[PDB]
Amino acid sequence: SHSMRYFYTAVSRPGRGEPRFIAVGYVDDTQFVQFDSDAASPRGEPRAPWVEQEGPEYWDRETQKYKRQAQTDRVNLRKLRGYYNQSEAGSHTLQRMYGCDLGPDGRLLRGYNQFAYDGKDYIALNEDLRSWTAADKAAQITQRKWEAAREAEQRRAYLEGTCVEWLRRYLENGKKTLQRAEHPKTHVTHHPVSDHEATLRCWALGFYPAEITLTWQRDGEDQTQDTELVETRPAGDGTFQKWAAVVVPSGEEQRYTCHVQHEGLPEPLTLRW
Amino acid sequence: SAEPVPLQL
Amino acid sequence: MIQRTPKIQVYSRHPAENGKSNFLNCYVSGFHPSDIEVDLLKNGERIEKVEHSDLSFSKDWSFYLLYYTEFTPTEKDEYACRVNHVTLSQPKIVKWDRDM
């Protein structure tokens, strides 16, 4: 159930000059790397103890890569401005997401390589790793350029071999925290609303991994439409938080049951107020 | 480890 | 250029205890572009030692950020999160609720 993902953010500034280049790298929901072009001497930064044991020479190589990407996204943003017949005036965004989902053995389950320009899909590597999906006419230019260059075939070697070898090294290096599941700490809170209503709130706290879903059931029936759900939030210690809420009649609370499914939970929990 | 050669579109 | 309005969650790291140490969080998510002003407030004032996560995105390309300050709840001090983005007609202030 493990994946390595890399997230790149390139933001142009009005007129000319260097764009803003941000690179984040994650192993599931645990970040191990940051790069920020906004530094007079930019460097690769380790965000997890398991990559800190990795050689200082490995740390120069990561920096050179992101320094190559930052230099490359300036020309990418420049080209797209021309694909969209846009001026140097005004800030634009170019995002790339690439990475690997680990299979049941030490094989690639799925490979990703996709782009967004101003937060609209641009081009995506298809599941076969041989093909691309262009969203507009502009992206079809990148696509015809990419199909001629055989970019997909070239990018295949990294997703399949390299991305996998590294996720595996990181999973062995961080086996203590990366390879374990921390179950949520469940409880229910009751909050009267009126003479005829009351909010029933099911909290899930201190869990790892993220968004491993809660539910409210009225007499065995899942409340898929009446459930007030908050987005899964980082606690800030590597753990996550989420709650599920439901407004219920005055004295009917007993019909409502909260369900929790988590890989750290050997059995789906049922709880009431 | 990041992908070595950058993607030019 | 598509512009998306931020989602704001104001909360503490561990459950609230008056007088005991904690970390105050403001999770901003689902926003596009990346330029954002995020501030944590103690009694409507700007907390100076508010740290943040390294900008990242979701499946839909929307951005997310985590701002945090190591705090102490009390009953009197009123913490909140203030956010500013292109989308907002005026900055959004979201009060920290112990049970939110």
Q: DSSP character for A231?
A: P
Residue A175 DSSP one-character state: T
Range(s) of the domain holding residue C17: 1-100
Task: Determine contact, residues A189/A216, Cβ cutoff 8 Å.
Answer: no
Q: Which residues pair with C12 in a beta bridge?
A: C24
> Which two three-digit tokens encode residue A59?
């740390």
Of the partner residues A9, A31, A234, the one whose CB lies closest to the CB of residue C34: A9
- Tokens 């899964």 sit on residue: A232
- C-alpha Rg value of chain A to the nearest Å: 23
Chains that touch B (3 or more CB pairs under 8 A): A
**What is the domain-level CATH number for residue A1?**
3.30.500.10
Q: Which residue of C has its CA nearest to A86?
A: C1
Q: Look-up: residue for tokens 């929990």? A: A269
User: Quick one: tokens of A26?
Assistant: 């994650």
**Whether residue A166 is found in the same domain as residue A200:** no
Which of A180, A201, A232 marks a domain boundary? A180
3-class secondary-structure state, position A203: strand
Rg from Cα positions in chain B: 7
d(CA A188, CA A186): 7
Local structure of C89: helix, strand or coil: coil
The answer to whether A184 and A262 are in contact (CB under 8 A) is yes
Q: In this structure, what DSSP letter does residue A127 have?
A: T
Chain A touches chain B, with at least 3 Cβ pairs below 8 Å, answer yes
Asked if residue A160 and residue A56 are part of one domain, the reply reads yes
Q: Do A148 and A198 sit in the same domain of this protein?
A: no
Rounded to whole angstroms, how far apart are CA atoms A110 and A91?
A: 33
Whether A158 sits inside 8 A of B6 (CB atoms) is no
Q: Closest Cα partner for A8 from C30, C5, C28, B2?
A: B2
Nearest-angstrom CA–CA distance, A148 and C3 = 34
Look up the domain containing A20 and give its range.
Answer: 1-180
Distance CA C41, CA C13 (A): 16
Q: Which residues of C touch A95 (CB under 8 A)?
A: 57, 61
Looking at A132, A157, A180, the residue that finishes a domain is A180
Burial A209-219 (b: 16+ CB within 10 A, else e): beebebbbbee
3-state DSSP assignment of residue A240: strand
Question: Which member of C23, C55, C66 has the closest CB to residue A9?
Answer: C55
Are A143 and A40 found together in one domain? yes
- What strands lie across the sheet with A108-117, from one edge to the other? A45-46, A30-36, A20-27, A3-11, A93-102, A108-117, A121-125, A132-134
What distance in Å separates the CA atoms of residue C12 and residue A250, rounded to the nearest whole number? 30
Judge if the upstream peptide bond of residue A266 is cis by omega within 30 degrees of 0: no
The CATH number for A257's domain is: 2.60.40.10
Residue with tokens 């991305």: A163
The count of domains in chain C is 1
Query: What does the alpha-carbon distance between residue A6 and residue C8 come to, in Å, rounded to a whole number?
Result: 25
- Do A153 and A190 belong to one domain? no
Whether residues A212 and A81 fall in one domain: no
**Best CA proximity match to A244, nearest among A208, A267, A218:** A218
Q: What is the largest CA-CA distance in chain A?
A: 70
Residue listed under structure tokens 């101003």: A118
Using the beta-carbon criterion (under 8 Å), do A24 and C68 form an inter-chain contact? no
How far is Cα C66 from Cα A125, in angstroms, rounded to an integer? 30
How many domains is chain A partitioned into structurally?
Answer: 2
Q: Kindly tell me whether chain C and chain B come into contact, counting contact as 3+ Cβ pairs under 8 Å.
A: no
Give residue C44's region: left, alpha or beta (phi > 0; psi -120 to 50).
left
3-state secondary structure of A220: coil
Mark A150-179 as b/e (b = at least 16 C-beta within 10 Å). ebbeebbebbeeebbebbeebbebbeeebe
Q: Report the C-alpha gap between A145 and A80 in whole angstroms.
A: 14
Q: How many CB atoms lie within 10 A of CB A238?
A: 14
What is the DSSP code (8-state) at residue C61? S
Label residue C83 exposed, middle or buried (CB < 10 Å: 0-12, 13-18, 19+).
buried
Is residue C95 within 8 Å of residue C78, measured between CB atoms?
yes
Report phi then psi at A58, rounded to 5.
-70, -35
CA-to-CA separations, A262 to A17, A109, A123, A171, A266, in angstroms, rounded = 48, 22, 34, 20, 8
Q: Are residues A42 and A98 in the same domain?
A: yes
Secondary structure (3-state) at C28? strand
Specify the residue for token string 């079809």. Answer: A140
Contacts of C100 (CB under 8 A, 6+ apart): C10, C11
Residues of chain A neighbouring C1 (CB-CB closer than 8 A): 92, 118-119
- The three-state secondary structure class of A149 is helix
Place of tokens 């469940």: A186
DSSP one-letter code for A178: T
Q: How far apart are CA A33 and CA B7, in angstroms?
A: 20
From the list C92, C88, C79, the residue with the least C-alpha distance to C45 is C79
Residue found under tokens 């999973």: A171
Q: In terms of domains, do A185 and A148 share one? A: no
The answer to whether A200 and A246 have CB atoms below 8 angstroms apart is: yes
Same domain, yes or no, for A49 and A76?
yes
Do A60 and A104 sit in the same domain of this protein? Answer: yes
CATH code, C65: 2.60.40.10
Q: Which of A250, A233, A125 is nearest to A195 (CA)?
A: A250
Using N-to-C axis directions, what is the helix angle for A137-149 and A56-83, rounded to 10°? 130
Same domain, A10 and A113: yes
Say which residues have a Cβ less than 8 Å from residue A194's Cβ, sequence separation at least 6. Answer: none
Q: Specify the resolution in Å.
A: 2.3
| Residue in the block written with tokens 């750290």 | A264
Total Cβ atoms within 10 A of residue A186: 19
Name chain C contacts of A31, Cβ cutoff 8 Å: 54, 56
Q: Report in angstroms the alpha-carbon separations of C35 from A17, A20, A158, C51, C63.
A: 18, 11, 32, 16, 10
H-assigned helices in chain A: 56-83, 137-149, 151-157, 163-173
Which of A180, A210, A241 is the C-terminal boundary of a domain? A180
